[PDB]
Amino acid sequence: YTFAKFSTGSMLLTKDIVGKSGVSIKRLPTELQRKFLFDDVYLDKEIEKVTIEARKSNPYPQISESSLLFKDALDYMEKTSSDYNLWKLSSILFDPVSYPYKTDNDQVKMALL
Amino acid sequence: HNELIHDAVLDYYGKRLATCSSDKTIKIFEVEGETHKLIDTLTGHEGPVWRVDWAHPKFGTILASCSYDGKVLIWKEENGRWSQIAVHAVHSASVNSVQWAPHEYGPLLLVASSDGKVSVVEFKENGTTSPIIIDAHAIGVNSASWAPATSRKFVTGGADNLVKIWKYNSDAQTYVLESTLEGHSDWVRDVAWSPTVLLRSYLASVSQDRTCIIWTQDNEQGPWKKTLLKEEKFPDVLWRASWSLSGNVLALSGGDNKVTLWKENLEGKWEPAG
Amino acid sequence: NTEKLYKEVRQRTNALDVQFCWYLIQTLRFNGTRVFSKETSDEATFAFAAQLEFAQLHGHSLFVSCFLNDDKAAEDTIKRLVMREITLLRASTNDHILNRLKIPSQLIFNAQALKDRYEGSEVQNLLDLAEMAIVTSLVQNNELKTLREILN
Numbered sequence: 001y002t003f004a005k006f007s008t009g010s011m012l013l014t015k016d017i018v019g020k021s022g023v024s025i026k027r028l029p030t031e032l033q034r035k036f037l038f039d040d041v042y043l044d045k046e047i048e049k050v051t052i053e054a055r056k057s058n059p060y061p062q063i064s065e066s067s068l069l070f071k072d073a074l075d076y077m078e079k080t081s082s083d084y085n086l087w088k089l090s091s092i093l094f095d096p097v098s099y100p101y102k103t104d105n106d107q108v109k110m111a112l113l
Numbered sequence: 114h115n116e117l118i119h120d121a122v123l124d125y126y127g128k129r130l131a132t133c134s135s136d137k138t139i140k141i142f143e144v145e146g147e148t149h150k151l152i153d154t155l156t157g158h159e160g161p162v163w164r165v166d167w168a169h170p171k172f173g174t175i176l177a178s179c180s181y182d183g184k185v186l187i188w189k190e191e192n193g194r195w196s197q198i199a200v201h202a203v204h205s206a207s208v209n210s211v212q213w214a215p216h217e218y219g220p221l222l223l224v225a226s227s228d229g230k231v232s233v234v235e236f237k238e239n240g241t242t243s244p245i246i247i248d249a250h251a252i253g254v255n256s257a258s259w260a261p262a263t264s265r266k267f268v269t270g271g272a273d274n275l276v277k278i279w280k281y282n283s284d285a286q287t288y289v290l291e292s293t294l295e296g297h298s299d300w301v302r303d304v305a306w307s308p309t310v311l312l313r314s315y316l317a318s319v320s321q322d323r324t325c326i327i328w329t330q331d332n333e334q335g336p337w338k339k340t341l342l343k344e345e346k347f348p349d350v351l352w353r354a355s356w357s358l359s360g361n362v363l364a365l366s367g368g369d370n371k372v373t374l375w376k377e378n379l380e381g382k383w384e385p386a387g
Numbered sequence: 388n389t390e391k392l393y394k395e396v397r398q399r400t401n402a403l404d405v406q407f408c409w410y411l412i413q414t415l416r417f418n419g420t421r422v423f424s425k426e427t428s429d430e431a432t433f434a435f436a437a438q439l440e441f442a443q444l445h446g447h448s449l450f451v452s453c454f455l456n457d458d459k460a461a462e463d464t465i466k467r468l469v470m471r472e473i474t475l476l477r478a479s480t481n482d483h484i485l486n487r488l489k490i491p492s493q494l495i496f497n498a499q500a501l502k503d504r505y506e507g508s509e510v511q512n513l514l515d516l517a518e519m520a521i522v523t524s525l526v527q528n529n530e531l532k533t534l535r536e537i538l539n
Binding site: 001002003004005006007008009010012013014015017019020021022023025029031 | 115116117118119120121122123124125126127130132134140142144146149151352353355356357358359360362364365366367368369370372386387
């Protein structure tokens, strides 16, 4: 016989006759494999990039503006890792380019970009 | 000495664990990572305590346990001293499951005993019990789980291999059965409603015939959809089946000494994870 | 039809992880770069928020949960999590800015009220249960203040 249900703090207790209680406080194996996520600095700087507005159907927060770019994550990864390659290439193809020099008309700008 | 605990429950905030074993005692622990310090032992049953279950802290510290002595015992911590405040044994056999409702419903309890009954015990203004019972299953009820909702409902797993979905009705004042589902060849051990307020609703029904059917209803209308999690019998009889709050992960406690975990993928079918 | 392909890519491979898929969808959304269904963006968002909550990263899961389009779901997810996990979400300033996302005053104190009833507050209540609080209180200045609050 075994028993196991999910915790409020989504994690699992199972029969375990090796502890003291007769159960095991198991930290559920997280699929989330990406180091900088567990460091709270990343999250702070990431909130710095957002504009939160209350909803038009309730007072709960939801994002109105985001300035997140594939670019931004790159500081938190090794330039050698394949991950870094993914995020970089993604930046190159998707993040907006800026062209600082003024251009005669705007279709030109588009061409330069 | 604790060779066979049958159930354990965690509180809303997870600071206080309550295991219950076969020696009739219910031990309360103050958990802290590695160190769960035993804070209490509770002796008041005349048989193995099958299940324990805290209530919503909105109702202070209450814990309804059900044991082999056919009696449901409500307990309560009082200034750091536990006391059996109430009891509800209108069931003529071993009481198996006991699970509180969503706290929006009041302080409702859900008892499910082998006399083919399932009760919903309200606790009135005097704190006294207001039992309104129904007959659930023929040869006995192994489990009964609540449903969240925003038109209340619950599920029951039977000894006649049924899985029933009951709903409240003001006309009847007793929960009127609205839909039954057939798919197991042996005692439906455990049934679970998923707390996912998402596009559809999910039910994981583990059973003795080593199957776990998943009843996914499209919505409020179109009936359920039978889906044998995997199409091979598990190496041994399955016991428990629990959903995760955040995520809709399914945990399966088979009598094969590991707990498996199954997640839904974009096929709609279920895949192991761990 | 990025989305079309994205959906195709989803059912075929796992090369794109939960986090990445969410980040991608969000960037493209908030930069006009591309278009995704409210439902696909919410799907991605749910998945990542959940992974995060499995990692005991409640602040971060909370932040992600806000990119939900469906207001009902956002409400539920957020509420549920804040109330269940208020204690941890009230430590540092990096946790403060958190509860200064725009977590509703109500939700925060309400959650905090629950944590008090369960550990055995009054200003929050001032902002049945009231009778029980009066019960617990059973000085003159406090009584007067309570009276003023009731009048208000």
